């Protein structure tokens, strides 16, 4: 039974289309989104059942790009493990969905967004979200949506809606916003030191722009929408609630007055364990029990701040935690630093390399190359846990990316600094926003390594607590205030402006007023941290490191250039492959060699002294014999029989000579 | 202590020896199979007890190829043998015929590992692998209905080939593996070039007759060297209870299965069950919990399979209302994706395939290194079976077993119609996305592939279609089901899939769960499947019946230039290092004819016109070492300055002019 | 802040411990530095226990930035534990485990990350010192702490904590860790060195070690927090008491019985007759039964009674041997000793087949490739099939035992790949892999210096009484207080491994142990040699061949080309390793005959 519904609307420069009822009919919901020539099939599947007493919402979004979308056969060996981009877009898509799924809805849902065709004029992430909104909306799955999304560029003082990839080459702002009709949900952006007034106006611009799509998706759901799932959250029995409150409230109140994190968490757990034990003394319950307990935590933490009382570690809403900053932390690194802000610590190591160390990426967008790679990883011992050490998690990529695009604007160009840079931020402790410590930390590690940055860059994490009209904007948030708070608001940049802005908003009905206030209280905190930073390292060091790849320089007769590059460019490639040294040659005459070592650096030249009289006493092998013998000196010259070892003269066959003349004679 | 028993016998051209009692002695059984110089160690291990409840049979086959078997050191750069397509596929090939041979209700976990110790090019490994499995299992004493042989059968010159090598299949119009017991064909797997059903069926029977010698060899080998057979029994019955559940539930159940609407139907069956459960409960009452509800479930489950089977056998319509011969609704579409080189959406009932074609350049060929390695594939056929197609949630990790197995079946269905590389100088990649599967998706993959390729302008020999079948057999009566649903394959005692063109079978796959499926039944089953695949062909032909007059503007193109033949040594270079570099540079296949042409394979134009330059410059303004001599491409004095004397116009010599 | 920094001197290098600055949230963490080698070591002990086994997991990881390098992968990151990383993790794990108190089920995870690496300081030792010190601060129940040292041999003199370059000139690379009191674990490779030299190295390592152990013991004081509250569970003498009085006599008679069936019958019977009368008057029973069971058998061997299979302590299981078992392999050997069996295959290749391993030891080529596969069927089990830890662990021991008798590449210009299949394992199969290798390399005509063998041993020590067990069964592993394995030639000892549970093990004995090992070694060797004595005078026909040709000296550069590009194309076209005499002939290393005469058709046109 095939009944195909299609809604079409016009989103700025492009025509968008949602189709349903043709493809993927067994999914709980599925939509074909086409925007320009960019097409995704977005299907959601949701289990009707949930595991009794589940602590988390098993939403999985899988965004996958098919190389047949761009007309290309996959390069390596089919499509392999997820590309960094795929991981990121899955994460970009997940974020805004999550808060729209009702509190307490634990059924596992899976969103799969597959790119069928990719148009260069239309980046995929935007219609992906539009699709996910539409698919979840069709499904009937409990959802508070529908959410739209928009990308906003900034060029010539105007705002660009849904810019292409090239168009962004001209933009100082790359920003994706996603929200509902009434509220902004999440924001991801990089920018070059733009002012808060611009960042905010950009979030608002997109939030207005996307309304057309949220309307369209909304009515699409009207026409073709399935039946709304009858569903309700797990129930709490207030008899038990009262019981839990009377027993744990006073203890939680103080337990939350413990400044030191691990001491706090231990005490909380003890309260939690006494509870469970106190209950048993008399599988859903324990969940129902945990629900009540968590609600209590929330109210306790929240009502403290809302009433003017001091925060968990005692700060007022406006004060950043204590910061200790060091550099030259590791002996063998090119650059390093240790950034400790409160209980959050990042050890950022910088490494340098030649083009050989540069990274090729493959994906839609075609095959490009990054000379700046930024890695971030988050080990279980920073949280005080025990876990598996396997490859980087979606957040570890997601946070690496954010930290990276915060820093990118101040990272020098290829022109000035002809290296490849690898930054690795390692979080050795995290009580909150380790993400921002990476930025801070890396800015120091980059300078400490001699990288000629435009200006020192730092970042801060904000949140708020709102009930009705009243709200407090928290600065330098800690894990608890993110978990029990209403938002996590990330701002990074230099003194002159914001390089990156990231928003995740749990609640709805947040206003530009609050947002406007949070961008500065952030701006303060940023400048506060910058000051404390600049006391250790204010500027990039005037030189790279000693163990850093350094160039070996030798000058060649511009005529002798015909050789070293070889016919077709083959001999220079042979050289760089054999020594692993990248060689750069002035059209005349100087050579500049990139050497990770002096051992190759010296191994790169010996190969170039080759391709490039006067005797000078060479040593070279005999090839032809006559009559004397032509030896091979690198060209050939005659050893006259008169000049063979004297006594008047065989004397050799072939295998192993001074040069005695030219217009080339030899002697022994 | 080691007691080593050997069995030597002739199989076709090759001497086969089984050994046991020397290696792998702690296995539940182990055999070293040798055929020609191909050698395998095949071992089986079975847990001695089933888990608490067990609803199924945990059979696992591991087939692995050591590269030392080929006297090679592995190419993988950490230099170790990620089970490959072939290793997976062959594992699945060995698995299939084993399953039906394990007795009903034997739930003990069983692992079969087949490792290739040495490889002979004359003797493909899978055949001895199946024989070895047959022997190890027999030796094990594990309960088994066996023992089974296998044979590969080729067709050349109108006559059958027994266990041919790859070299020999190059001249064969058929590649078919058949596995069976003394009395029965268990599984068939094959590709063929448009061969008629009787030649296909003839091959199955030729293999089945030909393998007997190996089955006999194994059977007596086992007799001699086997270990004590396991003492095992299928769960006891309660005949009285069964007769009672039947008398009670049968009439109502027959009426329930008259409801085509699932949720509505499953409701009734639950009612009938719950009622049955009450009735038993009263028949006892004061006796203590004498109602198990489990043994009842089993008896009940088995009764509804009987009943459904009976209804179809007596002419009743299938669960969805179709009779045995009718194929589900089909809808075909081409050119569904803007940026694809070709595409199709094939939907048959609830089975649906989005198939996409990508045209590519010699640069895109996927290399393969294995036993019989150093191979390039210009035809790349992938397959995808996402959780949502069956309407559930599942991980996305890598190609699954089924995805390889199904994907591969589809590929061998299509390959016979795919143009030779001389005729169509493109590498092809077809990716099959199964959006909806209840049905046979793999055959949908076939139909969609045939459409996708033509849509892309691939000059396929002819459109190819495929269809999946099932067969119910109760005693002497049987029914042949066309285009079976998913739930229908457990209904039947054998399932087969047949793909081909209007003129012949390009692939045939058979899995048989029972004994006494005759050449006659097969003959008739294949006919109904033919009538089916033509029905489907006719439908798809209405959308696109022949390849497109040309290639998508989005596909790779040839760029053509003319050169100086005397300069060919210059472009190819000394040793051929120059032309190499050019390709790895621009990523273009550069094929230089004797004189004087150059054909350049280019994905984009930019890549192509780049190949042009590096060529041209190397053959046909600027910027040295008074007088000028700047030299530019790898010497104007008056015209530096007429002002006399600081500080390519071109006309041993070689004097001018630059500036 | 603090930031407590202890500094001492280990031999040539200055070692530095510190804490309080970083990884504060961890149960404990230390930054250990030796020379310029730096490792963050951290220990997280999970809050509360759960179990009957010890969930200890050590992860030693290497960051490329420690070496100033960017990872060579496609993703430019490090996601794939290297064989090295897995090996070191295993190595750091061994000496720690036995130090963790009896009946401590609390889950512990130690993470040692290399943040900096010096060519003069191998990363092994500072890691172990740092793990020992990290666990120190955690306050986690521990009977430690310990330290580690490496010992080399150059010109009759031992070398403390030698570097990679220096090891080149050492006849010995030996790692040892131990508590102040006693030695715990040893891992070594030597070139046919005497037992006296090896064991002297274990002592030397143990003596030079105390400096570190002291430094550590102090570092804890200056910094480390007070211990964890803990104590061996619920010890019930009431439980012990009754069991014995109703248990020993019937059970000690149940092990005088033959191999199995009459064992698992009567024993299991006892587990009933005693199961029956218990309730007349918790799994806790299951143990103190097994522990008694242990004691029973431990005793019986000490009194010189049959081992579980009927063997005495000195006799090695019957050994059968075959070479050239597989038709198409370059070399083959099937080595069965008792119920342990290894099929081992030799494959030779051109320089094109050489291993490229990149890591903190610098970019390198390996022409000797050794692999070890331990499939589930050898033990009679079903299991899943990337090689596990123990496979690399056992594989690596086997390798280093064979390496010293392996020809240098100039003497035998072939890449070698040895693969060892364990088709049966009861009693050490890592040693079966060594015995299987000699034969296989020799069957393949690989001119090994001498046939090599190895044996796995065990020691039961109760008080001052003990017994040294030869060719230990898998089920004799729990019995032993020491599990050591030994491999070597008719002359010296190639490889030595030891792991030690109890204390008070004295030089006076393991000396003896190392002998009884030598006996068996010699014994095994004698039986091997009568199958294959010396390497085959020839390399197998199927193996790569060297085609030799002679061209005109003047044209040597028409082959090699310009900068070397022409000669690289030929080797990358035909897959042949090619070299030219200064002026003269040309040796072509070819896999097949075609491939090799493909190299000729090319070299001729250039001529």
UniProtKB/Swiss-Prot annotation, chain B:
Catalytic activity: RNA(n+1) + phosphate = RNA(n) + a ribonucleoside 5'-diphosphate
Annotated GO MF terms: 3'-5'-RNA exonuclease activity; magnesium ion binding; polyribonucleotide nucleotidyltransferase activity; RNA binding
Chain ranges passing through the membrane: none
Origin species: Coxiella burnetii (strain RSA 493 / Nine Mile phase I)
Annotated GO biological process: mRNA catabolic process; RNA catabolic process; RNA processing
PANTHER family with a match to the protein in the record: POLYRIBONUCLEOTIDE NUCLEOTIDYLTRANSFERASE, POLYRIBONUCLEOTIDE NUCLEOTIDYLTRANSFERASE 1, MITOCHONDRIAL
Family of the protein in this entry: Belongs to the polyribonucleotide nucleotidyltransferase family.
GO CC terms in record: cytosol
Record's function text: Involved in mRNA degradation. Catalyzes the phosphorolysis of single-stranded polyribonucleotides processively in the 3'- to 5'-direction.
Record-given protein name: Polyribonucleotide nucleotidyltransferase
Binding site for Mg(2+): 489, 495
Main subcellular location of this protein, as a coarse class: cytoplasm
Domain KH: 556-615
EC numbers for this chain: 2.7.7.8
Pfam family, one: RNase_PH
EC primary class: transferase
NCBIfam families, A to Z: polynuc_phos (TIGR03591), PRK11824.1 (NF008805)
Subunit: Component of the RNA degradosome, which is a multiprotein complex involved in RNA processing and mRNA degradation.
Compartment annotation: Cytoplasm
UniProtKB/Swiss-Prot annotation, chain C:
Subcellular localization(s) per the UniProt record: Cytoplasm
This protein's UniProt keywords: Cytoplasm, Magnesium, Metal-binding, Nucleotidyltransferase, RNA-binding, Transferase
Annotated binding of Mg(2+), by residue: 477, 483
Ribonucleoprotein recorded as keyword: no
Origin: domain of life: Bacteria
Gene Ontology MF terms in the entry: 3'-5'-RNA exonuclease activity; magnesium ion binding; polyribonucleotide nucleotidyltransferase activity; RNA binding
Catalyzed reactions: RNA(n+1) + phosphate = RNA(n) + a ribonucleoside 5'-diphosphate
Coiled-coil parts of chain: none
Classification via InterPro entries: ExoRNase_PH_dom1 (IPR001247), ExoRNase_PH_dom2 (IPR015847), ExoRNase_PH_dom2_sf (IPR036345), KH_dom (IPR004087), KH_dom_type_1 (IPR004088), KH_dom_type_1_sf (IPR036612), NA-bd_OB-fold (IPR012340), PNPase (IPR012162)
GO CC field: cytosol
Cofactor field: Mg(2+)
UniProt domain KH: residue ranges: 544-603
SMART domains tied to this protein: KH, S1
Family per similarity comment: Belongs to the polyribonucleotide nucleotidyltransferase family.
Role, per record: Involved in mRNA degradation. Catalyzes the phosphorolysis of single-stranded polyribonucleotides processively in the 3'- to 5'-direction.
PANTHER family reported in the protein's UniProt record: POLYRIBONUCLEOTIDE NUCLEOTIDYLTRANSFERASE, POLYRIBONUCLEOTIDE NUCLEOTIDYLTRANSFERASE 1, MITOCHONDRIAL
Subunit structure as annotated in this protein's UniProt entry: Component of the RNA degradosome, which is a multiprotein complex involved in RNA processing and mRNA degradation.
The protein's name: Polyribonucleotide nucleotidyltransferase
Name of the gene encoding the protein in the UniProt record: pnp
């Amino acid at each position: 039974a095939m009944n195909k519904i299609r809604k079409t609307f016009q989103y700025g420069k492009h025509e968008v289309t949602f189709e349903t009822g043709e493809m993927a009919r067994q999914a709980t919901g599925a939509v074909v989104v086409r925007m320009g020539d960019t097409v995704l099939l977005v299907s959601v599947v949701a289990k009707k059942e949930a595991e009794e007493g589940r602590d988390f919402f098993p939403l999985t979004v899988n965004y996958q790009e098919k190389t047949y979308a761009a007309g290309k056969i996959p390069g390596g060996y089919r499509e392999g493990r997820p590309t960094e981009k795929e991981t990121l877009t899955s994460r970009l898509i997940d974020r805004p969905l999550r808060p729209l799924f009702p509190k307490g809805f634990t059924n596992e849902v899976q969103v799969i967004a597959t790119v069928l065709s990719v148009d260069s004029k239309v980046p995929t992430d935007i219609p992906a979200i539009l699709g996910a909104s539409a698919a979840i909306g069709l499904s009937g799955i409990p959802f508070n949506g529908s959410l739209g999304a928009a990308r906003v560029g900034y060029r010539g003082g105007e705002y660009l809606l849904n810019p292409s990839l090239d168009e962004l080459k001209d933009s100082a702002l790359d920003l994706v916003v996603a929200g509902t009709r009434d509220a902004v949900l999440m924001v991801e952006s990089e920018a070059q030191e733009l002012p808060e007034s611009v960042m905010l106006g950009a979030v608002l611009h997109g939030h207005q722009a996307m309304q057309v799509a949220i309307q369209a998706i909304a009515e699409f759901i009207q026409e073709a929408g399935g039946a709304k799932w009858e569903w309700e959250p797990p129930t709490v029995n207030t008899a038990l609630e009262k019981w839990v409150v009377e027993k744990s409230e006073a203890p939680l109140k103080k337990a939350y007055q413990i400044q030191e994190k691990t001491a706090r968490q231990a005490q909380i757990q003890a309260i939690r364990d006494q509870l469970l034990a106190d209950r048993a003394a008399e599988a859903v319950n324990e969940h129902e029990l945990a629900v009540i307990f968590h609600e209590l935590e929330r109210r306790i933490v929240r009502e403290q701040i809302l009433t003017g009382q001091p925060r968990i570690d005692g700060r007022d809403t406006k004060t950043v935690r204590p910061i200790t900053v060091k550099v030259g932390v590791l002996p063998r690194s090119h650059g390093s630093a240790l950034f400790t802000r409160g209980e959050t610590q990042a050890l950022v190591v910088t490494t340098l390399g030649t083009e050989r160390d540069a990274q090729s990426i493959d994906d839609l967008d075609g095959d490009r190359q990054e000379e700046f790679i930024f890695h971030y990883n988050f080990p279980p011992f920073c949280v005080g846990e025990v876990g598996f050490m396997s490859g980087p998690k979606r957040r570890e990529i997601g946070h690496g990316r954010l930290a990276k695009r915060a820093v990118v604007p101040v990272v020098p160009t290829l022109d000035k600094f002809p290296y490849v840079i690898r930054v690795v931020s390692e979080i050795l402790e995290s009580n909150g926003s380790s993400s921002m410590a990476s930025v801070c930390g890396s800015s120091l590690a980059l300078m400490d390594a001699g990288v000629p940055t435009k200006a020192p860059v730092a970042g801060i994490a904000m949140g708020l607590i709102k009930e009705n009209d009243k709200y407090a904007v928290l600065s330098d948030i800690l894990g608890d205030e993110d978990h029990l708070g209403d938002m996590d608001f990330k701002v990074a940049g230099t003194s002159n402006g914001v390089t990156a802005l990231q928003m995740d908003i749990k609640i709805e009905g947040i206003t530009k007023e609050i947002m406007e206030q949070a961008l500065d209280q952030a701006k303060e905190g940023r400048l506060h941290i910058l000051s404390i930073m600049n006391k250790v390292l204010d500027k990039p060091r005037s030189q790279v490191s000693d163990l850093a790849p350094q160039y070996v320089t030798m000058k060649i007769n511009p005529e002798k250039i015909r050789d070293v590059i070889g016919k077709g460019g083959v001999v220079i490639r042979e050289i760089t492959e054999a020594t692993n040294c990248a060689i750069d040659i002035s059209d005349d005459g100087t050579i500049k060699i990139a050497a990770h070592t002096t051992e190759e650096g010296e191994a790169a030249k010996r190969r170039i002294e080759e391709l490039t009289e006067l005797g000078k006493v060479y040593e070279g092998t005999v090839v032809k014999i006559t009559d004397g013998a032509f030896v091979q000196i690198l060209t050939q010259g005659l050893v006259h029989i008169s000049q063979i070892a004297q006594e008047r003269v065989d004397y050799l066959e072939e295998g192993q000579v001074k040069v005695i003349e030219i217009d080339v004679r030899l002697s022994m």
